[PDB]
Design a protein around this motif. Sequence first.
Motif, PDB file in Angstrom:
ATOM      1  N   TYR A 107       6.296   4.118  -8.286  1.00  0.00           N
ATOM      2  CA  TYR A 107       5.293   5.019  -8.835  1.00  0.00           C
ATOM      3  C   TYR A 107       5.780   6.457  -8.971  1.00  0.00           C
ATOM      4  O   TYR A 107       4.977   7.338  -9.295  1.00  0.00           O
ATOM      5  N   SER A 108       7.062   6.716  -8.729  1.00  0.00           N
ATOM      6  CA  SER A 108       7.583   8.074  -8.830  1.00  0.00           C
ATOM      7  C   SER A 108       7.498   8.594 -10.260  1.00  0.00           C
ATOM      8  O   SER A 108       7.699   7.853 -11.225  1.00  0.00           O
ATOM      9  N   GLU A 109       7.190   9.884 -10.385  1.00  0.00           N
ATOM     10  CA  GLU A 109       7.097  10.569 -11.666  1.00  0.00           C
ATOM     11  C   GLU A 109       8.173  11.630 -11.837  1.00  0.00           C
ATOM     12  O   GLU A 109       8.190  12.322 -12.860  1.00  0.00           O
ATOM     13  N   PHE A 123       0.854  -1.177   0.000  1.00  0.00           N
ATOM     14  CA  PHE A 123       0.000   0.000   0.000  1.00  0.00           C
ATOM     15  C   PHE A 123       0.892   1.230   0.000  1.00  0.00           C
ATOM     16  O   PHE A 123       1.895   1.276   0.718  1.00  0.00           O
ATOM     17  N   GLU A 124       0.528   2.222  -0.806  1.00  0.00           N
ATOM     18  CA  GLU A 124       1.342   3.419  -0.928  1.00  0.00           C
ATOM     19  C   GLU A 124       0.450   4.575  -1.362  1.00  0.00           C
ATOM     20  O   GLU A 124      -0.610   4.376  -1.959  1.00  0.00           O
ATOM     21  N   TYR A 125       0.889   5.791  -1.042  1.00  0.00           N
ATOM     22  CA  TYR A 125       0.269   7.006  -1.552  1.00  0.00           C
ATOM     23  C   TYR A 125       1.327   8.096  -1.606  1.00  0.00           C
ATOM     24  O   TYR A 125       2.342   8.035  -0.908  1.00  0.00           O
ATOM     25  N   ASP A 126       1.060   9.111  -2.428  1.00  0.00           N
ATOM     26  CA  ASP A 126       1.941  10.255  -2.650  1.00  0.00           C
ATOM     27  C   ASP A 126       3.404   9.847  -2.794  1.00  0.00           C
ATOM     28  O   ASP A 126       4.230  10.167  -1.931  1.00  0.00           O
ATOM     29  N   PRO A 127       3.756   9.134  -3.869  1.00  0.00           N
ATOM     30  CA  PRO A 127       5.114   8.572  -3.971  1.00  0.00           C
ATOM     31  C   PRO A 127       6.190   9.638  -4.043  1.00  0.00           C
ATOM     32  O   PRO A 127       7.290   9.445  -3.511  1.00  0.00           O
ATOM     33  N   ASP A 128       5.902  10.759  -4.690  1.00  0.00           N
ATOM     34  CA  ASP A 128       6.741  11.945  -4.620  1.00  0.00           C
ATOM     35  C   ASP A 128       6.156  12.850  -3.545  1.00  0.00           C
ATOM     36  O   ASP A 128       5.019  13.318  -3.672  1.00  0.00           O
ATOM     37  N   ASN A 129       6.937  13.088  -2.491  1.00  0.00           N
ATOM     38  CA  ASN A 129       6.414  13.476  -1.181  1.00  0.00           C
ATOM     39  C   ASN A 129       5.960  14.939  -1.182  1.00  0.00           C
ATOM     40  O   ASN A 129       6.512  15.808  -0.510  1.00  0.00           O
TER      41      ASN A 129
END
Lengths: 30, 82, 41, 259, 45, 459, 49, 51, 67, 114, 505
Positions: free
Chosen positions: D196-198, D172-178
Motif C-alpha cells: 500500500y506504499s505511495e 491488517f495494516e495501517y500507515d504504510p508509509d511511516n
Amino acid sequence: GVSENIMLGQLAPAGTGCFDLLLDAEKCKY
Amino acid sequence: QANQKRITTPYMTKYERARVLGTRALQIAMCAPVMVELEGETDPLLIAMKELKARKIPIIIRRYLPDGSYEDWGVDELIISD
Amino acid sequence: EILLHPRYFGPNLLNTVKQKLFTEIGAGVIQPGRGFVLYPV
Amino acid sequence: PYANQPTVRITELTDENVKFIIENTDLAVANSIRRVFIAEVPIIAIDWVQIDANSSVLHDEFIAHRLGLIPLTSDDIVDKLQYSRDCTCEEFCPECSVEFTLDVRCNEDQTRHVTSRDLISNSPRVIPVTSRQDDILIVKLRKGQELRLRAYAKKGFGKEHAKWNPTAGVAFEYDPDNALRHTVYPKPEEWPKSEYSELDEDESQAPYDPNGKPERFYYNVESCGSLRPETIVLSALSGLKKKLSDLQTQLSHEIQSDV
Amino acid sequence: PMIYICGECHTENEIKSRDPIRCRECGYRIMYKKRTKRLVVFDAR
Amino acid sequence: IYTDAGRICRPLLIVEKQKLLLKKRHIDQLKEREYNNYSWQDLVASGVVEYIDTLEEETVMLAMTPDDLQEKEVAYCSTYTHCEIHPSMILGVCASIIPFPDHNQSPRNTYQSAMGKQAMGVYITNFHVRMDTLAHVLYYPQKPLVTTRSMEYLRFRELPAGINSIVAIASYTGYNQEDSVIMNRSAVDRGFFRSVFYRSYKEQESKKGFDQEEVFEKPTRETCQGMRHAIYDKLDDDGLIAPGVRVSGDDVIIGKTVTLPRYTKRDCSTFLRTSETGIVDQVMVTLNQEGYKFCKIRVRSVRIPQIGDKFASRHGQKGTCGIQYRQEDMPFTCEGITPDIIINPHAIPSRMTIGHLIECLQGKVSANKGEIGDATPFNDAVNVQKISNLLSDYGYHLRGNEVLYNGFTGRKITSQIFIGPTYYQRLKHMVDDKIHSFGEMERDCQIAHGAAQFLRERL
Amino acid sequence: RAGVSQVLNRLTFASTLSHLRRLNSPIGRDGKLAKPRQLHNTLWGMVCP
Amino acid sequence: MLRSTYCLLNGLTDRDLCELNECPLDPGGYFIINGSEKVLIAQEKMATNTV
Amino acid sequence: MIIPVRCFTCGKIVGNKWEAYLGLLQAEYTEGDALDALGLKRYCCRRMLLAHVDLIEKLLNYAPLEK
Amino acid sequence: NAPPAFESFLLFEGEKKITINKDTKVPNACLFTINKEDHTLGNIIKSQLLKDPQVLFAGYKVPHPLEHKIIIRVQTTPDYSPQEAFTNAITDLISELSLLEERFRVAIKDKQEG
Amino acid sequence: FSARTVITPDPNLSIDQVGVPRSIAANMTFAEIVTPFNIDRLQELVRRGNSQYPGAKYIIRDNGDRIDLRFHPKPSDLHLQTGYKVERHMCDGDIVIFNRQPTLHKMSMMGHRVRILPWSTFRLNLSVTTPYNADFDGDEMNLHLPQSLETRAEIQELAMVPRMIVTPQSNRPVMGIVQDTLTAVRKFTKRDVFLERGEVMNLLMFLSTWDGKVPQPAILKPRPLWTGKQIFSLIIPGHINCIRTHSTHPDDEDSGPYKHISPGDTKVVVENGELIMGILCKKSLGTSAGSLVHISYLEMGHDITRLFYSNIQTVINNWLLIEGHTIGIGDSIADSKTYQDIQNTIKKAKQDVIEVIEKAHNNELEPTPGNTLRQTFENQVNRILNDARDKTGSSAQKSLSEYNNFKSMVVSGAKGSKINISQVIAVVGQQNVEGKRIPFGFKHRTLPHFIKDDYGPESRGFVENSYLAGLTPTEFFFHAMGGREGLIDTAVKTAETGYIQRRLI
Ligand SMILES: [Zn+2]
Ligand SMILES: [Zn+2]
C-alpha cells in the motif's frame, strides 16, 4: 543448646524461644 | 527482679513482637476476652496486632539474663515500633 | 498447678483460679503452643 | 464527543478472500474488528465423536483430533443453530447439532485414503468444504483395517477452540508509509515498501506528520471455507454490535439500582 | 467366553478360565484381548 | 606394530606428493553404487583411504582440506601424508544435529547433546508392537528446515524429533522472562507439539506352594478379603480390562487373587499407577518361562502442552512455557503471521548462541525458497551476509527483523521484532509428571530466622 | 567392575544411537592418577568433543 | 546380539523385517535378556605390554 | 505420522495438499514451484509441507492385528 | 487445574456482568468491573471515552491474563456522570458499527454486481 | 503439609505473592478454630466439604475425634460449635514459606502470600528470582504451610519477602529490578521518551499507589506530552533523595562544564521523590549499596518498598508493550570499516608474535629476572594477544549504534557484558587450559594438522574469529577444550555448595 532441645523436640532457646510470656491478670480486668 | 534496676533495653524485640502476637492471636481464637472494640474485625491475628498497637495485650515478658536472673516487662511498658 | 482456659481471662480470672481450685496464686506462665495458662498454687 | 462515521472500499473479492479498506475509524475499533474475525465469529465444527471400530495405525483421539479440524460449510444454518448450552434437549437434537457418520473398510490390495469425502451428514447444508481440488485426508487404511464412527458437529467460536476459527490469515495494516513513526527504523533504507506504499522509488519514509492519527486500515480477510469471506466480516460486525448492546442492557440494570 | 486373537496367524479362538494359552491351527503362544464394546466419547479437540 | 583389539581408529584420505590419491574416477564409480558393484571396501582396497589409530596419528601430517595442498605464498607444510575427509566428522551423533555449531559457545553445544536425548519424536517405527514401560511419541514430528549433512546418516529425516516453529525473539508481556517461553494456544489447539504417553503394566500368575497360588480372576466382595473402594467392574471374567476402556487412578486393570492359607481370598490386584486418566491401548497374554499365564497391559494418554512443559531449540536454550495466548492476542505481522513461540532476548547475549540466530535466518530463506538449508559447520560457502542477501530477494528485511503489531491494541511496536522458523523440541519433562503435594540446611536457616516455634512445628 | 550392560534407552532414536556408541572411563586406580575429565588433544576425530 | 551374523534378522530385507514386526531402521547391537534390551558400554583401560 | 489438517500458525487447510504436492514433485517441479502451484504463499504454510515426514507409509508396512 | 475454555466467556451462577464502584480517591470517578470480557471490549470503550471532552480520565486493564475480567476507570467533569459517559460511549460504538455494517453490505453489492 | 512443583514466572504477582495450583491448594489444609466470629464461614466450608475446593477436609471435635468430610458423612455430624477445629483447604491470603534447594541463606526460605491460579505450576514474581538463585528452565520449589496461628504469626512478622529485602550479610538489598523491566527502565528514562495522553492514562492504570491525579505534562504546547521520567517520578515513593551515575556516565563530565545539566542525561538525581534527571539502570535500581531501591528501604521501610518493586514492574512492562525489545542478526553485525580495523589489528598482532618467536628461535631474547626464558617468552606472547583482544573489542563497542540491542542490554546491565559483545562481533580470543596456552598433547604439537614446535597463535589456540564468522575446525576443538575446563570447575564448585556452611554452623 539448640541441637539438644531439637533432639528432644523442645523449643530451642534461640530467637523466639529465648524468653517466657506470662499472663498479666491485672490488665485482664478491662 | 523489681521494676527498678531493669538493665534490658526498653524496646520490644522483633522476636518478642512475633511471639506476643502469635500467643495473643491463639488466645483470641480460644474466646479470650478482647481488650478493644473490634469494628467488625474477625481475624484473631489482626485483632492481636490491633491490641498490640493499642498496648492492650495482657501479657508480661520474662527476659532471662545469662546469669539466670530475669526481668519482667509488661508489653505496654516496651516501646513498640511496627 | 491449675490450667485455666483463655475464655476465663476476664476480670474474674483470679476468682476463677480459686473457684476452680475449690472444685478440684503464682505467676501464670503461658504454655507455648496452647492457650492454657498454668498457675501454681 | 460522538461516533466516527467510517467508510469502506472493497478492492478485491473472491470466494477465498476479501481485501477492503476502512477509513475514518479508530485504531481501537479497527483492531477489535480483526480480533472478532479470529475469535468470535461462530462456525460449525465436529466436537463430539464416538468410535465404534478403529483398526488404523492412528489412535482414536488422534483421529478425533483430525475430524474436529475439518472445516464444515456453516453459512446458512450456523445463525439458525442454538448453542447446546442454550438448547432444551438432553444431549443433542437438530436444534443444536449436525450428525455425521463414517464407515470405511480397506479390502483392496492397495492403500485406501480415507477423506472428508467419506464423511456423510444428516443434512445437506452442512458438509465438508472440499466436498462441494482434493479432499482432506483423514487416515490411510491397509487391507483389513477399518474405521467406523459417529460424530456431531456443534456451534462455537475460535475463543473456545481454534477449530472454530473461520479465518486462514487476517492481514491488517495501517500507515504504510511511516508518517506516524509508530515504528522507528534504525536504517529506513533497508526496509521493503508495503503493498500500500505511495512513496516514490527513492524516499524511504513519509516525513513525520505531527498531527496525524491512525485513520486508514487495510484488511485482507482470508477464509478457511466454513464461511464466505465477506460473511465473516458481516458476522463480526453483527457480533461485536451484539456484545456492546448486551453490555448496555446489563449496565442499565445496574444504574437502575444504583439510584 | 473370552475371545483372543493370535499374534501370528490373526485367527480368533475362544479360551476359558485357567485354560493354557495356545493358538489352535498354528500353536503360537501370544494372544491379544480383542477390543471393548463399551462406548467412550471423545472431544474432537 | 599393533594387531591388538580395542584400538580406536578413523579413516583418512592418503596424500602423496601433495596430491590426493582419490581421483574423479573413484567418485564416478561411487556415484553408481546402487547398480555398479563398487563400494567403500573398494576404496580401501584401492589404497585410497586408510585407517589410522591415535598413535599412528603421532606420525602423520594432516591436511584439513585439499585447500592445504594448494601452493601458497608462504608455505606452511610441504609434506602432508593424509587429508581429513570432512572436518565435521569429529562430531558424534547428538552433536551432529546441531546447526551452525561453530557459531555457538561450546558449553551450549554440550547442553544440546544432552537435551537432544530428551526430545520426543518417533523413537522407532514398530512402536505399536513394543510394550515398553514408558514411551513418548510426537503426533506431528517434522524434519528440520535447517539441517546438517551428517543428519542424513543419523536417519533424522525418517525419525524426526521436533517441529519447525515460528519463533519471535521478543519481550512481550513478560511471561517469557529468564528462560520461560510464550506459546501460541491456537497452534496448540491445532496439534502443535501434541504427543501421547504409553505406559505398559506386566502381571504374572504364580504357584507358591502346595495350596497357595495367584490367578487372574475378577475379585468380589463376597469372597476376597483385600477388597478396597477401588473399582473392579471394568474387569472382564478373565480378570483383565480390554483395550478401549477409559481408566483413571484406583481403577483396577488386572484382577489377581491369592488364595488365603467371611473371607477366603486375599487381593493382590494392580492399580493404575497414577491418577492420570488414560485409555487401555493393548492387552497381550502369553506364558512366561515357567509356563504360568502372563499379561502385559499398555495404557495411553494424550499430553497437550501445558504452561509447565519444557522446550528447547537445538542451541541449549531450554525453557518452560510461561503462558499461552490465543492468536487474537499474539503479536502479528502485516501478513497476519503470529509466532508459535516467543522467547526472551535476554536468553541470547551472555549465552552467545549465535547459531540459534543464524538458524532462524536460514530457515526463513529456506521456507521461502522452498529448499532445506545446509547448516553443516566449517562450510566456507555459507555466510550470514549471503543468507541476508538471499532473504532480501523475497521481500523481507535482510536481517530477519519484521514490523509486528500488538495483538491487544493493534498499534505497531516501536522496535521491529526478529522472527523466523526455528526447530523446537518437546522434552520428556512435563509438569504433570512432577506436581506433587526439610533437612539440615533448612533447619540451619530457620535458626538464623529465629523461627523457633516453626523449626519445632516442622520437625 | 559394574555398571556395564545398561538398559537400552528408547526415549528417542538419537538417544538409542548414542547409547550404542557410548564409552566409559576407569574411575579407580588409573583414573585418580590421570586427568580423565579434561578433553585431551588425542580425542580429535575419535571421541566427540 | 541382535542383527549380528548369528541373529535371525541377519541379511533380511526391509520386507522380511516388517513381516517379523521388526523396524528396518533399528540398528541392533544389543541383547535381549528376560525381555530387556541390554547394551554393553565399552570400557576404557590402559594398554598392556607397553612400557 | 500424517499431514496436519491445518497449518499450525495460520489455520490454512493443508491436509488436502500432500498427495497433490507429491504428484507435482513427480512431475519434476521444484519444491518452490509446487508450493506456489498449490497456493501456499505464506512461509508458515510452506514449511507445513516442505518439512513433512509421511511416516504413516512406514506404519502401513506392518500387517494388522485382526484380519 | 486446566480451566474449561468456556470459563473465559460464560458467567458462572450469580456473577454480574458489570459492577460499578465509586473511586474514593478523587471526585467524579468510577471503576467498572466487567466479568468475562477481554481487550476486545476494553480497548474500544476506553478509546471512545477518550473522544468525550467531558471525560478527564479513561483507562482499562486486564488484572491478570489467566482470569477473564476487565476494570475500566472513568473520571468525568462535575455535573457529568462517569456512568453517563460509559453509556454514551457504547451508544456511539453501536452507531459507528451499524453504519460500517450497512456500508460494507453496499460495497459488497457494488463489487459483486460489477 | 508441603508441596513441590515446577515454578513459572508471573509478572502480575507482587513480590510477596506466590501463585499456587488449585489442586495443591485442595490437597493442603489448615486447622482453623471455630469461634462466633467465623462459625458461619466455617459451616459453609463444611457444607461444601472436600467436594468443592473452597471447603474442608475434617471437623475435629473437643473429644479429638475427627469427622472425615472426604467420604461424605451424615449431615447430622456437620454441626459446628465453638472450640472445634475445621481443617479447611488452603485459601487466598494464607501464609506459606517458599523454598529452593540448596538453602544457603535465610532468603532461601521466605514468607509468601497465596494466590490460587489456574494450571499446575508455582508462580513467583521475577524480582524474587535473585534471592532464590531461581529461574524457569525447569526449577522446582517447595511450599511449606505453617499449621498454627503462632507459627503463622512468626513467619508474618519475621520472614516475609519484604522484610528480607535488605540482607545483614552485606547491608545491601537482595532484590533488584531484573531482565525486561531493567532494559525497559533504561529505555523508558531517556530524554527522548514522550508519552501521549492515552499512553499515560494506560500506564497510570497499573500504578497501584497513584493518588488519582494526572500530572501536568512536561510539554503543553504544541501537543501535551509527558516524559518517562515524569511518570517514573510517580512510582518513586515518598520524598526520597538520591544521586547516582548511569553506567555510561563519562569520567570528565563532573569536572568540566555541564556538571549539572548533563549532556547525555547520564547523571541521576532524585529529589523530594521526583526523578529530576538521569537515565536509570542497574546502578540505580539494582542490588548495589546506595541504590534508589536501598534508600527506599532505609527511608520508607519494607511495606512501601514492596509496592515500589511491584509498581516498577507492572507499569513499565506495560510500556514495553509499546516500545518492544528484541535481539537479532543485525545487532551482531558491524560495519565494513569496523571489520577492516578489527582484521588489521589481528594481522599485526600475529606478526608481532612471529617477531617474538624469531628472537626466541635466534636466541636474541633475554630472560626477565625471576622468570625462565619459557616464562619470558609465554608472557610476551600472551601480552600481545590479550592486547589485540582488547583493542579489537573496544573497536567493536565503538561500532554499535544507539539502536543496537546488545548494547541496550549491556548498558542497562540487564544481561551480557562488553566481552560478550566483543566475542560475538570481533574476536573469541585465546583458549586456555589450566591457565596455560593449549598443551602439546601430541608429541611437540597440539594436533596432527600442525608441524612440530609451532608456538604461534593458531597452533596454541588463539581463536581469531568471532562467533558470527564461526570457528575454524581447530578453533572449534580448542574452544571445546577451554569450555571443558569451565564445565569441570562448575561440577567441582557445585559439590561444595553447603560444605563450609555445614562445618561452620
Ligand atoms: Zn495362531
Ligand atoms: Zn500458515
